[PDB]
């Protein structure tokens, strides 16, 4: 569905709200992220310990 | 009133465009009625004669599809016993009724299931195809450019004197740029004959040509031939397949 | 529970700029010749020679290296029009200096492609480059 | 010029009766009939050879194999988890330049160079972009914003003597799928994502201003800058005062993929149009 | 739709084929030299096809389509006229070579 | 090794009817037709031939993954065991090794 509003979108019949995550797929999205994605902050920080642990 | 052709597209500096006679079928003798240029890279190309047997020999084995299968031993019905015993019959050994060897057997080595031969040559080699049988079609006189593609009468016979009073040889092959476009006195007249064809400008190829021993190009074709044929001079390599957006290939 | 949408249309020029061209644009006006990448173009009139030479889709001269049999060194010279043989001789004295003999040398007429036994793809890019092909 | 086609005239016409291969192009088989290939086909006389039934490939015969009696050692080890850089010229990208592929009044960045054909990349082959090499920084008398994924110290040294901009940032292989070929992406009906952070092996690389790091802090650029000035004896150029400043000052948000676009925006090709969000929540989730 | 005869591809230049070409390009070029009128041009798309058209319906004989990018000057086309063409084949040409008399030949089809 | 007797009737085949006059017409649809369709999408036969090409085993396993499901019981047997052989002839024998 997804495929036929960008090949056509205008005649393809399809509401365009479709094609953003649902609040459920959303949810899921930020927790998968964020968990498994560090932050900048953290990676910045992690590499700290690491230098100072083996100077 | 003289109808004339000058080339669109930037003719090469170091040549010079090729000419041809431009006629009407409105009449037997409304023949020479103007002069068009045709582009030196598309209608006088090289004469490669050997680009031309293998595009002609593809358009015939790519798409064949055999259908010839026969069963190997192990397809056949039964044999599935050693009929006698290997030691002290005093015949030869054998281990199934099936084998090759005997009367009712498979093949050992048969045509297997439907085979496909499907190979794709390169696209420039198939457009170097298309150039240089239009340069020998035009080099041996068999080229002849009609303008707008009209006819008096949708009468068969008269084209059938037409091309032997302008000694068109047995076959001639019409072409027209779109379906929908081709006029009803031309398609009546040609859809009762055998040797006279009409086929559109995108169902034109290198074995049609070779078919009919001669080749009617109308003036929209022949501008649609040299803008769909020049295009593979200076192009990049297909990305993505041309059928996708491009910024200056619609 | 669809979320709602606003439709533009003033920002689909940065999307233009994306789309590739599907043919090789011709190369710009520069107020000095040579380039500094090296790049030479071809002289405005045609040179009064009976051979001509072909510029490559890419507009580079189109002589080219080749191998084979992981020995066998060759440079091939690709898309030549009008009397071969002349464009032969010429190569012949033009190399005879260099190698104080008549290198070996195979014409195609049916494609139109001189094969010359060596490398000596760096020389023949000049010499061309200054007869103006 | 084809001389060849004059004397077409005088030979009769081409047809399908008279068409011939070119010579040497099509080498004819072989069957096993006759004296010559007979009555052994070319197999031999007894043994496994005859009979088809040797053994695979390296094996000597019971004796331990050439490929068992190597001790192991990690030269492919990782390999696929390797990060692979395609290398970009300076002679090259002259060379681009001057034939027009490229054009240094537009900024250019991973995607002009795809589109100009000037470098390739596979992001399924562990290819995290484009690095510099510094082959032809002699001849480089070019002035461009280019923006790559790994730069050399010589490389940096040779733009920024004309006066230009270079700039390394980092690309997610799922991002950079995208970055290299978009049309097809905009062609599958999702929003735009954002761009993941550089992992933790590769936070240094983009965080010091040595390698013009994006993410680093643009306060130590301008003395870095002059440092390699002093150190390859090249007068620095003050770039704030050309006319192209604003298009050589131009940059990309950490999370931005393409110039100007935003996450979470649809490009609806068929009708020229492009699509934004509303909600609160997805306007958050795509510009955090 | 009256059919016409089938016309015969066989030319045979005549005594006036300099008073005809003459003739004919000072009616459709008045350009040039009187005397040098085999040097005059005819590189005009227009021009060529008045000047190739009147020929072909005085002599009776076409320039064809591949020849056409060769008729360029008003000496191509003089020679081009100058040079006879017959539509016999050559069993034709040998049934009357004044054969010899024991030489019988039987065409028959 | 006896052979007939009689002549048999001379085949009067036509080269102009319908099928070898129009042979081979929409060949270059993708070069002359903006490249909407390839040239493989007009080939008439199996579904798991058209535009496909490969040995007798990479074409008995096609055939197995694509119509598998949709053939008769003794079928689907005599297919495998054509795809076993072939696998063991092609792996395990041959002279070049
Ligand atoms: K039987
Ligand atoms: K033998
Ligand atoms: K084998
Ligand atoms: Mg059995
Ligand atoms: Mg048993
Ligand atoms: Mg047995
Ligand atoms: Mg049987
Ligand atoms: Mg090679
Ligand atoms: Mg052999
Ligand atoms: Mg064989
Ligand atoms: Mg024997
Ligand atoms: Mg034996
Ligand atoms: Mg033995
Ligand atoms: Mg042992
Ligand atoms: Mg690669």
């Not at chain 3, 003033?10 to 700029?17: I, K, M």
């Not at chain 5, 045979?12 to 040098?36: A, T, Y």
């Not at chain 6, 019981?73 to 054509?82: A, G, M, S």
């Amino acid at each position: 569905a997804a495929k036929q509003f960008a090949r056509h979108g205008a005649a393809s019949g399809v509401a365009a709200g479709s094609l953003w995550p649902s609040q459920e797929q959303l949810r899921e999205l930020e927790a998968e992220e964020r968990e498994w994605y560090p932050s900048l902050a953290a990676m910045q920080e992690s590499l700290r310990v690491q230098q100072l642990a083996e100077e | 009133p003289p109808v004339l052709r000058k080339c669109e597209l930037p003719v090469p500096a170091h040549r010079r465009p090729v000419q041809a006679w431009i006629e009407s079928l409105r009449g037997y003798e409304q023949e020479r009625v103007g002069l068009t240029e045709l582009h030196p890279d598309v209608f006088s190309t090289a004469p490669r004669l050997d680009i031309l047997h293998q595009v002609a020999i593809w358009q015939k084995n790519f798409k064949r599809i055999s259908y010839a299968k026969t069963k190997t031993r192990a397809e056949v019905r039964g044999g599935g016993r050693k009929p006698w015993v290997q030691k002290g019959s005093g015949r030869a050994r054998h281990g199934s009724i099936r084998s090759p060897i005997w009367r009712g057997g498979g093949v050992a080595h048969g045509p297997r299931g439907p085979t496909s031969y499907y190979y794709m040559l390169p696209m420039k080699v198939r457009v170097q195809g298309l150039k240089v049988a239009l340069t020998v079609k035009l080099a041996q006189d068999d080229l002849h450019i009609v303008d707008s593609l009209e006819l008096p009468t949708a009468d068969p016979q008269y084209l059938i004197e037409l091309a032997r009073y302008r000694r068109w040889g047995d076959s001639v092959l019409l072409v027209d740029l779109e379906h929908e476009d081709m006029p009803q006195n031309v398609v009546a007249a040609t859809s009762g004959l055998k040797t006279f064809n009409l086929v559109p400008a995108v169902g034109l190829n290198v074995h049609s040509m070779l078919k009919h021993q001669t080749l009617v190009l109308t003036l929209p074709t022949v501008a649609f031939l040299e803008e769909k044929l020049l295009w593979h001079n200076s192009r990049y390599t297909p990305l993505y397949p041309f059928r996708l957006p491009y910024c200056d290939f619609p | 529970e669809y979320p709602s949408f606003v439709e533009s249309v003033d920002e689909y020029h940065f999307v233009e700029r994306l789309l590739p061209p599907a043919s090789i644009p011709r190369p710009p006006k520069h107020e000095h010749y040579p380039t500094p990448s090296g790049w030479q173009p071809p002289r405005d009139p045609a040179p009064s020679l009976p051979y001509f030479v072909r510029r490559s889709r890419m507009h580079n001269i189109p002589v080219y290296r080749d191998i084979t049999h992981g020995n066998r060194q060759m440079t091939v010279i690709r898309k030549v029009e009008g009397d071969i043989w002349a464009l032969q001789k010429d190569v012949e004295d033009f190399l005879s200096p260099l190698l104080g003999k008549t290198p070996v040398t195979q014409v195609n007429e049916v494609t139109g492609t001189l094969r010359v036994k060596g490398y000596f793809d760096q020389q023949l890019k000049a010499w061309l480059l200054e007869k103006g092909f | 010029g084809p001389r060849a086609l004059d004397l077409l005239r005088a030979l009769p016409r081409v047809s399908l009766a008279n068409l011939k291969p070119n010579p040497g192009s099509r080498k004819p088989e072989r069957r096993p009939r006759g004296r010559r290939r007979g009555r052994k086909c070319g197999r031999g006389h007894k043994g496994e050879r005859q009979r088809g039934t040797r053994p695979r490939l390296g094996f000597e015969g019971g004796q331990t194999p050439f490929y068992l009696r190597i001790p192991k050692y990690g030269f492919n080890e990782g390999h696929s988890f390797r990060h692979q850089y395609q290398p970009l010229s300076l002679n090259r990208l002259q060379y681009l330049i001057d034939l027009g592929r490229v054009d240094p009044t537009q900024p250019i960045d991973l995607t002009q160079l795809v589109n100009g054909r000037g470098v390739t990349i596979q992001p399924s082959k562990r290819d995290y972009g484009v690095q510099l090499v510094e082959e032809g920084a002699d001849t480089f008398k070019a002035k461009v914003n280019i923006e790559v994924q790994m730069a050399s110290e010589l490389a940096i040294a040779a733009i920024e003597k004309n006066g230009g901009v270079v700039t390394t940032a980092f690309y997610d292989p799922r991002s950079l799928e995208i970055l290299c070929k978009p049309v097809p992406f905009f062609l599958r009906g999702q929003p735009i994502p954002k761009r993941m952070l550089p992992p933790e092996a590769l936070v240094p690389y983009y965080t010091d201003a040595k390698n013009r790091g994006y993410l680093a802090d643009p306060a130590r650029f301008p003395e870095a800058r002059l440092e390699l000035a002093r150190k390859y004896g090249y007068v620095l150029p003050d770039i704030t005062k050309d006319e192209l400043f604003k298009m050589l000052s131009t940059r990309k948000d950490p999370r931005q993929i393409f110039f100007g676009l935003a996450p979470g925006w649809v490009v609806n090709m068929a009708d020229k149009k492009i699509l934004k969000p509303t909600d609160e929540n997805l306007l958050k989730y795509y510009s955090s | 739709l009256v059919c016409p005869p089938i016309q015969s591809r066989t030319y045979i230049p005549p005594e006036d084929l300099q008073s005809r070409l003459e003739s004919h390009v000072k009616e459709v070029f008045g350009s040039s030299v009187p005397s040098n009128w085999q040097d005059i041009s005819l590189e005009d798309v227009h021009l060529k096809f008045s000047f190739l058209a009147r020929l072909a319906n005085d002599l009776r004989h076409a320039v064809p389509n591949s020849r056409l990018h060769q008729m360029c000057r008003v000496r191509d086309v003089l020679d081009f006229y100058n040079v006879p063409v017959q539509d016999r084949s050559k069993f034709d040409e040998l049934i009357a070579s004044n054969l010899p008399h024991n030489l019988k030949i039987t065409w028959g089809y | 090794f006896h052979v007939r007797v009689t002549l048999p009737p001379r085949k009067v085949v036509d080269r102009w009817n319908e099928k070898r006059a129009m042979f081979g017409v929409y060949d270059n649809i993708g070069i002359l037709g903006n490249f909407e369709k390839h040239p493989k999408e007009l080939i008439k036969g199996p579904i798991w031939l058209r535009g496909w090409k490969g040995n007798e085993l990479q074409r008995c396993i096609r055939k197995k993954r694509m119509v598998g499901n949709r053939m008769f019981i003794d079928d689907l047997h005599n297919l495998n065991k054509r795809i076993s052989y072939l696998y063991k002839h092609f792996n395990r024998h041959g002279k070049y090794r």
